[PDB]
Structures are given as C-alpha cells and as structure tokens.
Amino acid sequence: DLKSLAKRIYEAYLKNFNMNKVKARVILSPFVIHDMETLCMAEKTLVAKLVANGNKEAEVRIFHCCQCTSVETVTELTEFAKAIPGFANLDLNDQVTLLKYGVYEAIFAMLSSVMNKDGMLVAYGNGFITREFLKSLRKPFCDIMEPKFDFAMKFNALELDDSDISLFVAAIICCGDRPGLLNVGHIEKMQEGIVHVLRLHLQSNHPDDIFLFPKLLQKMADLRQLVTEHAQLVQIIKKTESDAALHPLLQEIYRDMY
Ligand SMILES: CCCOc1ccc(C[C@H](CC)C(=O)O)cc1CNC(=O)c1ccc([C@]23C[C@H]4C[C@H](C[C@H](C4)C2)C3)cc1
C-alpha cells in the first residue's frame, strides 16, 4: 500500500504542476535572455501587457514576474496537497498554516528542476534566462537570484526524479513544527506517514545512495533557512524600493512568517 501511495503522490504531482523534471530536461536538451536587449524582446513577446506602457526599471519588472510565478505555484501546490493522506481531513486553519510555511520551501525545491549551472527555464518553458544576467542586475535584486542557484546545484547533484521530488514536496508540506498549528498530533502522524513512504521509496529507487534520505532531511532544513533569508531580502526590497510593490497574496504569506 505504501508503494501505491507513492504512486498516487507522483500522479498528483504530474497532474497539478505545469512543470516537472522530465519536461524541463526535454526542453533543455526557448528564447534566451542574456542581456537587456533580449530581456526587453522577451517581455514584448511573453508578457506584452507588462510593457505596453510608458514602465518601471528592468529590475522591478523581473521582480514582478517572479511574484507572478509564485502566486501561480501557490495555486498548484494547494491542489496538490489534497492527494496527501490526511491533509484534506485537517482543520481548514491547519491546511492554511501548512501551505503558508511550506509553499516557498516547495517553490525553491521544484525551481531546481528547471535550473542548471548556466541559467533557468522560465515563462512556462518558453524562456531561458542566464544566471550571469541575473547576477548583473543592480542590488538588491541580483541578490534574490544566486542563493537559489547555489541550492539548486547541490540539490540537482542528488539526481532525483519526479517520483522522488513529488514525495519530497509532500513531506515539506506535512510539517508538524509549523507556527500556529492547532492539531499538531494529527499533523505529526500525517508527516510520519509521508516520510515513511518517502524513506521506502528512496530506498528502492536509489539503491546506490544509502544516505539519500538523511541528505534530503538536511535539504528540508536548508530550504527552511533559505526561505527565512529570502523573506528578509524581500522585506528589504519592500521597504527600500518604492516602485517594487508586493502582490497581496504574497504579503499574507510573508505576514508573521519570518
Ligand atoms: C535564481 C532566480 C530564481 O527565480 C526566482 C527567484 C525568487 C522567486 C520568489 C519570488 C521573488 C519575488 C517571491 O518571493 O515570490 C521566484 C523565482 C522564479 N522566477 C520565475 O519563475 C521567473 C518567471 C518569469 C521570468 C521572465 C522575466 C522577464 C524576462 C523573461 C520573459 C518574461 C519577462 C518572464 C523571463 C523570470 C523568472
């Protein structure tokens, strides 16, 4: 039954997220954004509306686009969470709390799938923006980027596939030590359930790496630290960048988190 469970999670994953490792890799076998010219060209083609005006600084335009993808991923993650044994049985408040603290950890984890040493797949697989171009953005915007690449390079070295990743994201969501949780016991039990299936799955799908499970547990901790830091930088931008407004949904997510 745990094998079937793992499968269920994997199918929900393939079904709820527009992007996955296999699709990303086939594509990376896209318009390349490597400088300001290609950036502006990409915007006119892929998000025309955003530039059909008289327009904010390039850095802010990108920032807004990043927010847009996050809001979308929140929706995908919310639907995905229903395939986790016990999630849909939780109090609505706890479901909200679990998604609130888990979304960004999930987001940066899955982001690794479309990232390689030189850049990342963007805009529903229609673009590829270079890591170096992102580093060339003026501070503090160029500082949003790099930390995610650093994490992705190490995460991708674990050579996980979507069946692995789906369970990992599920595990990220089922976190009992999240602030405000009403029924921690039931949540801990749900968590124990997913980690158990994740442990067994890694064991059979990765017989060559006997430390994969421990490594991933560590990655979950890394992601949590990665997120608090990302939140800090977002906060800095919000306060110091007058033209860089934050989408209401994301403000609520960042509200009282870190
Ligand atoms: C290492 C960099 C990783 O990128 C990041 C970084 C942080 C975040 C989190 C965001 C930051 C505001 C958040 O807090 O929600 C999201 C992404 C995800 N960004 C995207 O998915 C993304 C989406 C669209 C684009 C565009 C931007 C321009 C150029 C090109 C076409 C079009 C217009 C979309 C790529 C770029 C990045």
Q: How many residues does the chain have?
A: 258
Regarding the beta carbon of 244 and ligand 1, being less than 6 Å apart is answered no
What tokens does 170 get? 């599920």
Quick one: CA torsion of 137, 141, 142, 145, rounded to 10 degrees?
-130
CA 119 to chain centroid: 16
Residue 73, C-beta contacts closer than 8 angstroms, at least 6 positions apart: 17, 103, 106, 107, 110
Q: What CA–CA distance (Å, rounded) separates 253 from 20? A: 24
Residue 35, C-beta contacts closer than 8 angstroms, at least 6 positions apart: 133
Beta-bridge mates of residue 251: none
- Whether 223 and 173 have beta carbons less than 8 Å apart is answered as no
The residue contributing the CA closest to ligand 1 atom 20 is 66
120 phi and psi angles, rounded to 5 deg:
-150, 150
Residue from 19, 37, 69, 133 whose mutation best tests the ligand 1 pocket (most atoms within 8 A of CB): 69
Q: What CA–CA distance (Å, rounded) separates 41 from 256? A: 38
Atom of ligand 1 nearest to the CA of 129: 35
Q: How many CB atoms lie within 10 A of CB 184?
A: 13
The residue contributing the CA closest to ligand 1 atom 37 is 66
Domains along the chain with CATH numbers: 1-258 (1.10.565.10)
**Experiment type:** X-ray
Q: What CA–CA distance (Å, rounded) separates 203 from 133? A: 39
Q: Can the peptide bond before residue 140 be classed as cis, meaning omega within 30 degrees of 0?
A: yes
One-letter identity of residue 249 = L
Closest CA to 18 of 95, 94, 91, 110: 110
The residue contributing the CA closest to ligand 1 atom 32 is 43
33 phi and psi angles, rounded to 5 deg:
-105, 110
CA 28 to chain centroid: 19
- Bridging pattern class, strands 119-122 and 115-116: antiparallel
- Whether 236 and 139 have beta carbons less than 8 Å apart is answered as no
Q: What is the DSSP string of the chain?
A: -HHHHHHHHHHHHHHH-S--HHHHHHHT--EEE-SHHHHHHHHHHHSHHHHS-----HHHHHHHHHHHHHHHHHHHHHHHGGGSTTGGGS-HHHHHHHHHHHHHHHHHHHHGGGEETTEEEETTTTEEEEHHHHHTSPTTTHHHHHHHHHHHHHHHTT---HHHHHHHHHHHH--TT-TT-S-HHHHHHHHHHHHHHHHHHHHHH-TT-TTHHHHHHHHHHHHHHHHHHHHHHHHHHHHH-TT----HHHHHHHTTT-
Radius of gyration of the chain from its Cα atoms, rounded to whole angstroms: 19
Give me the resolution in angstroms, 1 decimal: 2.0
